[PDB]
């Protein structure tokens, strides 16, 4: 029930709130009333059901704000996991809130989230568009094409991307 | 003497030597023919008090048996009381290993006692170390696992009988209970029926805030423990808190909040355990693992606020365990689900099973028709189940934003389970033809 006169419970509803929010800026809103309302925690370690690959949590684990990193880290997560459920719309939100999120943040980890656009976007023209797909728009096999030809800096390529996109 | 055989035990105790064989021998038989239990506590006291925080010893340990095992056969309430006043009050080393290493029933009962009052006079003063005697005899008498129940009971009448020391009894044992990791559960849920509950009321209105935070932390111990009868114990709490069978509406309320606090803990202790650590057992939950299936029941026989509690405390089980049971929670549901606000239920439990893990639909599609060509899962269960799946794909066919939302994809997963749906329509059952026809 609202408003339960204990901030730990208080706490405890919001999280779980936050766990069964689906929306990135409702996401937003509950992570950063919850950091006003605590101290400078992480709050990720409040569902242990989300899984990141250690690849990419080292650097999404590099940056100093604790509220920005828990921000990425719960959207990426929750986008991962709804696209392994093959969710691809509220998958494009989150992943797409994240993007504005990490236009702030470092080349590095906004060319990862690039990456993470790539398969996004060529597992939803594989499910949602279905097999009966007649022709793919080409843009994206054009983007597909000219990120193979280059694969230029230091950016850790997954071999489960390289080998979708093959 | 004493001295004397006191220096021989010790020098036993520490140097592993045969010299103190015959002394220990004499004093034995000396102490059978003074026949005295207070000269035999008396003698075992110190010589336990110097050769058990000095070294371990055999044959020290065994005169020193033999002559509490002497003192107990003679009568000696007050030696039994000056020595266990002496244990507590030299509590060095290995006290517990020697007060306790009598092993009488009578002996047993008797420090039980003596270390209750320890603990109640520990809760009364507020004391560190008295606290810490009173849990290092809580200590000794769990480690002499022989017959706790009776002293528990009584120290639980005694408890519900005051108002004043009552809040300061039931933290004692609270306490004493979250050290001992509540072996006298079942017991201690089956007694308090009505008249235990109005007492305690009683209690809880005497006590205060520092009450309310032990009530708190007493919940927060039953749900992490309680893993002999946990449907008994949630069937008291249910029916006491949501169907308002308590006698108080204070205690109901206390239920109502308690179960809250309850599942907020357990929601913490499913989630916020730690990703790179292993997560801890929960015995409530694990002990409801096998009762899974009658929580749906319940839930499907919908009560005021108990069947949305126990949705919660379906979704949070299910994500607490590892095979994740959430087929057998869905495929129960659909066998004895009648109608849309149960199917509803249906869908908010999948909505949370599907933002928390996969596979939800094709586990339990197999689950569900393996039971169906099984021999159980009789013809109304069955077509109500094939008759529910129909009215959920129809309704997925249909649907603008409720199917958009939660994308369950029921088309395709009965598309993947189509070819052991033909027996289904040859099934002998005019319903089981019909919906199988439908669906």
Same mark, same amino acid.
């Given at each position: 029930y609202d408003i339960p006169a204990s901030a730990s419970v208080n706490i405890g509803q919001l999280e779980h709130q936050l766990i069964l929010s689906v929306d990135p800026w409702r996401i937003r809103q509950i992570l950063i009333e919850l950091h006003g309302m605590t101290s =400078? &925690?992480?709050?990720? %370690?409040?569902?242990?059901?989300w899984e990141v690959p250690s690849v990419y949590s080292g650097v999404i684990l590099g940056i100093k704000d604790n509220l920005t990193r828990d921000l990425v880290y719960i959207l990426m997560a929750k986008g991962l996991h709804c696209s392994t459920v093959k969710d691809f719309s509220h998958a494009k939100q989150l992943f797409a809130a994240c993007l504005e999120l990490v236009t702030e943040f470092s080349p590095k980890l906004r060319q990862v989230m690039l990456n993470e656009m790539l398969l996004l976007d060529i597992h939803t023209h594989e499910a949602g568009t279905g097999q009966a797909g007649e022709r793919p728009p080409s843009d994206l096999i054009s983007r597909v094409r000219g990120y193979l030809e280059m694969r230029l800096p230091d950016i850790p390529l997954r071999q489960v991307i390289a080998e979708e996109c093959v | 003497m004493d001295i004397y055989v006191q220096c021989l035990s010790a020098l036993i105790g520490s140097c592993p030597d045969a010299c103190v064989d015959a002394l220990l021998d004499t004093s034995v038989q000396h102490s059978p023919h003074f026949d005295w239990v207070v000269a035999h506590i008396g003698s075992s006291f110190p010589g336990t008090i110097i050769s058990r925080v000095l070294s371990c010893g055999l044959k020290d340990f065994c005169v020193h048996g033999g002559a509490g095992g002497g003192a107990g056969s003679s009568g000696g309430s007050s030696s039994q009381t000056p020595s266990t006043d002496p244990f507590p009050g030299s509590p060095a080393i290995p006290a517990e290993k020697r007060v306790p290493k009598i092993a009488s029933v009578v002996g047993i009962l008797g420090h039980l006692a003596s270390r209750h009052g320890d603990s109640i006079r520990r809760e009364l003063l507020r004391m560190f170390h008295d606290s810490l005697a009173g849990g290092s005899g809580g200590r000794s008498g769990d480690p002499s696992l022989q017959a706790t129940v009776p002293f528990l009971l009584q120290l639980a009448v005694m408890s519900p009988? $005051? $108002?004043? %020391?009552v809040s300061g009894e039931l933290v004692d044992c609270l306490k004493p209970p979250a050290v001992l990791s509540q072996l006298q559960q079942h017991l201690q849920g089956f007694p308090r029926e009505e008249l235990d509950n109005m007492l305690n009321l009683a209690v809880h209105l005497v006590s205060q805030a520092s009450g309310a935070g032990a009530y708190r932390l007493l919940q927060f111990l039953v749900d992490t423990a309680m893993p002999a009868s946990v449907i008994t114990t949630q069937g008291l709490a249910v029916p006491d808190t949501v169907? =308002?069978? +308590?006698? &108080?509406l204070i205690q109901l309320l206390l239920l109502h909040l308690q179960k809250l606090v309850h599942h907020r803990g357990g929601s913490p202790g499913e989630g916020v355990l730690g990703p790179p650590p292993p997560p801890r057992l929960v015995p409530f939950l694990d002990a409801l693992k096998n009762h899974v299936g009658e929580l749906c029941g319940e839930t499907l026989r919908l009560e005021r606020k108990r069947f949305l509690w126990q949705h919660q405390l379906l979704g949070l089980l299910s994500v607490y365990?590892?095979?994740? +049971?959430g087929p057998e929670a869905l495929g129960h549901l659909l066998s004895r689900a009648r109608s849309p606000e149960e199917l509803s239920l249906a869908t908010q439990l999948y909505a949370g099973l599907v933002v928390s893990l996969s596979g939800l639909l094709p586990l339990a599609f197999r689950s569900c028709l393996a039971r169906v060509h099984a021999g159980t899962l009789q013809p109304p269960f069955t077509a109500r189940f094939l008759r529910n799946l129909a009215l959920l794909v129809g309704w997925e066919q249909q649907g603008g934003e409720g199917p958009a939302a939660l994308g369950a994809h029921f088309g395709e997963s009965a598309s993947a389970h189509l070819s052991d749906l033909a027996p289904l329509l040859l099934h002998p059952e005019e319903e089981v033809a019909e919906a199988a026809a439908s669906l």
């Open positions: =400078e &925690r992480q709050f990720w %370690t409040v569902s242990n059901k | 009988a $005051l $108002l004043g %020391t169907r =308002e069978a +308590c006698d &108080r365990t590892r095979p994740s +049971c």
